[PDB]
Amino acid sequence: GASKLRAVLEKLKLSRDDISTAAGMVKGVVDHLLLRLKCDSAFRGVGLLNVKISAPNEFDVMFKLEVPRIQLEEYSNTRAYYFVKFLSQFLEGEILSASKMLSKFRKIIKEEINDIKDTDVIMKRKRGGSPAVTLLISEKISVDITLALESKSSWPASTQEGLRIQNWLSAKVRKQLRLKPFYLVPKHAEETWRLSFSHIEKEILNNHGKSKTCCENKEEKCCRKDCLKLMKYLLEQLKERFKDKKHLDKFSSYHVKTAFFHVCTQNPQDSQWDRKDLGLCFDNCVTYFLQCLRTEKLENYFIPEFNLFSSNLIDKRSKEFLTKQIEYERNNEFPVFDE
Ligand SMILES: Nc1nc(=O)c2ncn([C@@H]3O[C@@H]4COP(=O)(O)O[C@H]5[C@@H](O)[C@H](n6cnc7c(N)ncnc76)O[C@@H]5COP(=O)(O)O[C@@H]3[C@@H]4O)c2[nH]1
Ligand SMILES: [Zn+2]
């Protein structure tokens, strides 16, 4: 039961030196990119947001951009995607073009990756939709660099009922977090940006307990992070197996992370994450995730009425597929976690 799950966690640790040198190799490139971008007029004020690492060999950095005051107009009744208006060059009328601002980004990075031949890097474009300009360092370490407009404005109205952390983290912490900037990434679904809160996701994962002193001492070790690790790992391991038909590629660790936050709201006390109960805690996350699949419904933690599992994004076939795989997995004490 747990023993099997502790074994997986111990295994996972064995590659703790592998990801640290691979990410140090990401760092050197990102530092290099920040310099060359602060030499351009458009991007002069860029910085790094802080918040990295998704799957093994897959990294994510965010390049924040301080911008004057933003006014948003919600695109359609899609609660996450917006237009932007008061960098002049990128105007299409009064609207700041995501597509245009994402092209001058991708441009600068392509030119300035050929030189510094020191490291062997290739610029890539991965997928449509995506706001990430995706590099591949020495054909093994791929990094997602995502540009991010910063708005020190009050969050948009579609986030009014999101971040329901009051019963787990304090109502006062939700106020602290919603006084913080939010971010727009040029993901279009069109010249449209969509909301991001990856910096808030980093804080509620690292400052995750009802007790302010969760995980700071031997009396208060919860298994929240471990559970999210096992969930992330369950998805990767399954995405490997069923790559004989590449039928699970729409699912990602964000889904696992999103669903885990939802479980943390349902189970707000550290006592529900006692590390002795790792097995039952892990069950909790897997049963909720299933429910999300089978009900075709998984709310963005910050944008409730944005359904990461609607038909728009993932079709019914792929979700029924993963429901069957995860259901079999749970019913049999997870043979994917064997040997
Ligand atoms: N590195 C990175 N940061 C991003 O913000 C992001 N947003 C999209 N993508 C990639 O673009 C493509 C389109 O996915 P879609 O947006 O339609 O659903 C996405 C998206 O709605 C959600 N999601 C992923 N990252 C974030 C994020 N930071 N904030 C909010 N939602 C996110 O989870 C779904 C699957 O994402 P990924 O399959 O892991 O990579 C996606 C995908 O390749 C991103 N990649
Ligand atoms: Zn803890």
Ordered by where they begin, the domains of the chain are 15-152+183-197 (3.30.460.90), 208-337 (1.10.1410.40)
Query: Distance between CA 57 and CA 40 in Å, rounded?
Result: 30
CB 43 within 8 A of CB 34: no
Instruction: Say if residue 314 is exposed, middle or buried (CB neighbours under 10 Å; 0-12, 13-18, 19+).
Output: buried
What is the token pair recorded at 200? 């808030």
Q: Which residues contact 115 (CB under 8 A, 6 or more apart)?
A: none
What is the token pair recorded at 294? 């089978």
**Atom 29 in ligand 1: which residue has the minimum CA distance?**
196
Q: Which residues contact 15 (CB under 8 A, 6 or more apart)?
A: 56
Technique of determination:
X-ray
Query: Distance between CA 82 and CA 5 in Å, rounded?
Result: 42
Q: Give the position of tokens 């969760």.
A: 214
Query: Distance between CA 281 and CA 263 in Å, rounded?
Result: 10
Q: Give the position of tokens 């043979």.
A: 335
Ligand 1 atom nearest residue 308's Cα: 21
- CA angle 29/30/31 to nearest 5° reads 90
Query: Distance between CA 80 and CA 255 in Å, rounded?
Result: 16
CB 42 within 8 A of CB 128: no
CB 88 within 8 A of CB 23: no
Determine the number of helices (DSSP H) and then strands (DSSP E) in the chain: 9, 11
Please count the CA atoms within 13 angstroms of the CA of 105 that sit on its side-chain side.
Answer: 28
The amino acid sitting at 159 is T
36: which strand partners?
none
Ligand 1 atom nearest residue 194's Cα: 30
Residue 238 has a CB neighbour count (10 Å cut-off) of: 18
CB 33 within 8 A of CB 133: no
Long-range contacts: 311-316, Cβ < 8 Å, 24+? 313/250, 314/250, 314/251
Short-list 22, 232, 12, CA closest to 143: 22
What is the token pair recorded at 286? 């897997």
Residue 81: φ, ψ to 5°: -100, 135
Q: Which residues contact 118 (CB under 8 A, 6 or more apart)?
A: none
Resolution in A for the shown PDB structure?
A: 2.7
Does any ligand 1 atom lie closer than 6 A to the CB of residue 249?
no
Compute the radius of gyration of the chain from its Cα atoms: 21
Ligand 1 atom nearest residue 127's Cα: 43
63: which strand partners?
48, 147
CB 165 within 8 A of CB 263: no
What is the token pair recorded at 201? 């996701």
86 Cα to the center of ligand 2, angstroms: 42
**Atom 31 in ligand 1: which residue has the minimum CA distance?**
196
First to last CA, the chain: 14
CB 119 within 8 A of CB 25: yes
Query: Distance between CA 63 and CA 65 in Å, rounded?
Result: 7
Does any ligand 1 atom lie closer than 6 A to the CB of residue 78?
no
48-65 burial string, b = 16+ CB within 10 Å, else e? bbeebbeeeebbbbbbbb
65: which strand partners?
46, 149
Is 276 annotated to bind a ligand? Reply is: no
Question: DSSP of 24-36, one letter per residue?
Answer: HHHHHHHHHHHHH
Q: Give the position of tokens 């601002």.
A: 101
